[PDB]
Write a protein that binds this ligand. Sequence first.
Ligand code: PAR
Ligand code: MG
Ligand code: MG
Ligand code: MG
Ligand code: MG
Lengths: 125, 138
Amino acid sequence: PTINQLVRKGREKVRKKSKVPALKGAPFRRGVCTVVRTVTPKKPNSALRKVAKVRLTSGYEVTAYIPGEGHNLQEHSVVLIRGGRVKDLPGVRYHIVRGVYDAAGVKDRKKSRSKYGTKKPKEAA
Amino acid sequence: MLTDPIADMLTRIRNATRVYKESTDVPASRFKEEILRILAREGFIKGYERVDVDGKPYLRVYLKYGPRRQGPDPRPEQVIHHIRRISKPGRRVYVGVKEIPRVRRGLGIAILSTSKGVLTDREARKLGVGGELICEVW
RNA sequence: UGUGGACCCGCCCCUUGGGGUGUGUCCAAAGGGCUUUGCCCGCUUCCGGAUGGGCCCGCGUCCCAUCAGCUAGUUGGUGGGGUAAUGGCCCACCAAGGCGACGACGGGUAGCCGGUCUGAGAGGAUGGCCGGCCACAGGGGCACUGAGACACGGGCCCCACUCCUACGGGAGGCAGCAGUUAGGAAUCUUCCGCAAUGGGCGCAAGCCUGACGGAGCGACGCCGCUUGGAGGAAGAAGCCCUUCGGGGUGUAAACUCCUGAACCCGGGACGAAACCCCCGACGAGGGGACUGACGGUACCGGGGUAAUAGCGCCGGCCAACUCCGUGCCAGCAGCCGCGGUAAUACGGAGGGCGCGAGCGUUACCCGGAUUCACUGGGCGUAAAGGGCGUGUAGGCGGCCUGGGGCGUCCCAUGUGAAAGACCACGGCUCAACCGUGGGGGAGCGUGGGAUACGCUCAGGCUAGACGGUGGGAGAGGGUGGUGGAAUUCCCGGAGUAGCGGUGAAAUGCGCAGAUACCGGGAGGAACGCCGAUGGCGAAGGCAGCCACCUGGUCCACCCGUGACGCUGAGGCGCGAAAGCGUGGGGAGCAAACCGGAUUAGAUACCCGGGUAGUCCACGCCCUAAACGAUGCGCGCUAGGUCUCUGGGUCUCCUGGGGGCCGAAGCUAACGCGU
RNA sequence: AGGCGCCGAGGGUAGGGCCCGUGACUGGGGCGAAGUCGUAACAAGGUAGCUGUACCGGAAGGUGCGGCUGGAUCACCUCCUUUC
RNA sequence: UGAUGA
RNA sequence: AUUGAAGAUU
Ligand SMILES: NC[C@@H]1O[C@H](O[C@H]2[C@@H](O)[C@H](O[C@@H]3[C@@H](O)[C@H](N)C[C@H](N)[C@H]3O[C@H]3O[C@H](CO)[C@@H](O)[C@H](O)[C@H]3N)O[C@@H]2CO)[C@H](N)[C@@H](O)[C@@H]1O
Ligand SMILES: [Mg+2]
Ligand SMILES: [Mg+2]
Ligand SMILES: [Mg+2]
Ligand SMILES: [Mg+2]
């Protein structure tokens, strides 16, 4: 644009949008479950994926992924939510933190133990 | 109407050299002359002189090149590699002495107009004055 | 009493209510202690200082124009009132004004800054701790007192809440330190001390001080430190790989010596010398004493134990590979993507990479992102030229000379607090942290200077633009008129059995005689050949011929004016087709629709009919593959060839259009290319 | 002292404008390996396509009018290129 | 006139 | 049963 033009209109600040209304910015939100459905992925993916409908302290009600081997969640389960889409499941944009509230940690977990929320086990250790 | 005469000159010059012309008229103005003097002195042009064409004052500018050149494409190097307007009617550009640019670590010039007259950048810097930054040239 | 000060009037200097002066008028005071006639603490008037503040002004300060008009104390005035003081701050009266595309008004969001984070920088983001300013003290009013408040722990009233109530009435306000509860992903002790610093009152001794100086909780952050050091096999076991030879964990362990975090014993701070008292003189100066929350802590000396490792990752980006399990499952997943019976990508295991009292995850900010491009981007086909003009504001402006000096540039000077930042040297054993010193600095104010460029004023020129005279080409537009070819119908003639239509057919029309043929008539619409690779117009668009009304434009002459220029937000006008309204018209064509075929079906392609519409006048609509998908103007940069239209000295030369090929150059390419 | 008055937080009734809520009924839209109907489009896509508009039809669409090439194939042409 | 997902 | 594996097919 001419320079007069920039004096007239100026450039416009590219201000862009959140991917995670875990509202008040907040790094995590507390919710209570509602469904604990299973969902089919899309794309070229086939499987039965674990999901909860979560009613939030945000005021918001949304779907969240339940990561790891197997869970222990049902209707009234009460859980912490973290954000992290699933990407195979369009419309799933939050994960459930495992090992907080009524969500068990992953039993029998040796490797990426810190996610999945499972304490240092004792064997020869 | 022709809206930036000094742009014009720089361009006439830029244009004539890329087809290796020996010379170009440009319609004459005192200011244009002052810029030419620098070009001449700094060794970018051979020289220049006043002349008429259709009986109106012009300025023949004698341009200057390198030697005929090595292999496929024998075109001489240019002496005036780059000649660019900085200040323009759209956007006037002025510098204080502390902020006059250094063109191509000194291997280049920046003509620049002051209330002590038109000067290369070293010239201006020495007489510790700034002004309208006319064009760079390297 | 009147040093003096206040006020009215005058006069002088000075210049907004600043000094000075003269009548007149008006206005002061408080006592206390004593080491008691002479000192200490006070009181009163006034002039100054110092510090702290009020008020005003230039400039700067976020998002939305899908917020465009706003405003009655409104804008100004005269006279009051009110204040410490200016002011519609408030009031009476008069005037009719003020503000806004340079964004008024309205909506949203927000305490501002010093700074902070990020970035090469320009910039972006931000304003927690610390320092400065502002505003608020349950929400809303309001004044009192005072040098100062319209007062967080003062007052009054209204409201909402909680508490007491003998039901009339009352009490109250942690956004002070702790602490409780609620909300939340989440944020501390109902600690110790006035020892230091600082504050209030007091002559002092002192008292008050949840300011503060410390300690406590939390890996929340930064910095320092430990979980050992040297030996120690061709190399235990176990575990893992294995072409069954072996290879790996691995000097790692074991084991030898050595040192000695922790822990124990002994000593033990600086931070604190003042106030005060004595001497001197209640001064200067000298002497003396009291005082430590932190704390039996830091630090010093002695003794002394081998004494904690975790988390993430190993398909590519990205450093790190193997065996099982699993079979599009269970699962992974920042993006690309892994898994369907041989998975370095899932889960486990060996081994490996990375970091280490941490490591990862999520959220958020800057980066990379020249991905809003000022630095530093683009629009023929990628997203992007406005459908075209006209011209308003605005932006931009040829050549010469002079004034001015606004922009711009230079010198001096003031300002830019401290913290922070950067550099030095210092103190804690280092560092973090801290002290001291030095050096930057835009922006703004003042004084002086320059004048090239920009601006402005005044003059001047003719190269831009406009005009004059003379010539030209054109489907440029408007109005009236007229011409022939064809189709349809109507009338007459002659004439007989089909015509029409298709891939083939049928619907249809024909003996009320159609088709074909000849003559006459009516009507509507469109203009064959010329016709072009042609012309005209800003676009849409414009085509028989004739007249009239009218737009643009090209050439020659070099005659006039003297920069009168370019572009153009908004406005206004034009704008193909189809469509809308009113009134006409209606030949041919033809959405819809009615039939005939076709087809698996055929709401279609083909065939026979047919209304709107196509046509005219007037008024709307305002769209498009409104295209060169290429905004407008000007200057510059090889040529060749075809063409329309001028001029010349007419091989040619020279203008203005239309084309193609293509120097230089440009482009992602295709292409573009006077 | 007390009284009256102006102003005045706030409240009321009428009248507009505006924001949140919820909402019976209702319109589409995005996304989801292997459901149904046809076959519009891409080759001349088997009626060249696209387009503004207008009517119509389960659906893609079809047709009318005008426009565009951002259309295949054959011709006559003239341009370019080619010489010569 | 049609030719199921990777 | 079929397929690389599935959907679909008996
Ligand atoms: N997507 C917007 C419009 O949506 C429509 O798409 C929607 C449906 O029409 C389309 O349906 C397809 C169907 O076309 C196709 N012929 C058969 C197929 N099973 C369907 O599939 C759809 O529905 C199935 C459930 O059966 C889901 O598995 C699948 O995610 C989805 N693609 O799937 C879309 C919903 O996913 C148009 N077909 C689409 O082309 C158009 O763009
Ligand atoms: Mg770009
Ligand atoms: Mg485009
Ligand atoms: Mg297929
Ligand atoms: Mg698959």
